[PDB]
């Protein structure tokens, strides 16, 4: 849930 998987 970090990197590309983090929602912004």
């Amino acid at each position, epitope marked *: *849930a*970090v*990197g*590309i*998987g*983090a*929602v*912004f």
Partner: antibody
Amino acid sequence: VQLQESGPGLVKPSQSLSLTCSVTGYSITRAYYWNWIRQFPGNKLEWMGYILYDGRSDYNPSLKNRVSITRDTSKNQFFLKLNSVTAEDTARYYCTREGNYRAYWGQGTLVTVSA
Amino acid sequence: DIVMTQSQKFMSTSVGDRVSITCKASQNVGSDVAWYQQKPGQSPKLLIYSASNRYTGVPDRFTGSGSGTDFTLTINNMKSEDLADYFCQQYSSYPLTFGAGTKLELKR
């Protein structure tokens, strides 16, 4: 977004390696993770660290205290400094933008650590 | 240090064959895994995200699947333009970690 790495391609051992990532098409204070990742000879990939859009940063423990990632929000650039380099730091250095299930990478820039 | 182990470093294939690359995570990473494709002289490019989802522009012949510690990238009907190195990556937590990469070769 477009990312472009720049900096000296030859660094003497024990000195510091500095690279700049120039970002265009997106604001580095707006969103995501802004990373440095390097690729060794033999193609192994290692993630070095990030600076977040809010200026917080974190690093791969494999790098000890050697690494610092920093930014210029006026120029929309972020920066890598890696202290006390050795030959095993020879690599192609990439900067990336990650988040929201997107990944953008620069073309990378080779740095050779040699005397 | 979540370690991503890829099966074999080099795989020989023929055009039109299905090829499957596998990556085994040391801990449970859920669905948070990406596959990257890297052609010579190019940066890696994201191929699959969230283990099953093709990225923008990626052809339908690429599929991925798996959960837990086991993940697969599938090339259905290999093409010559798929000659490349492939890397799994986990984004469950930092530090990000990549598989060692698999190089495809075409038989002729």
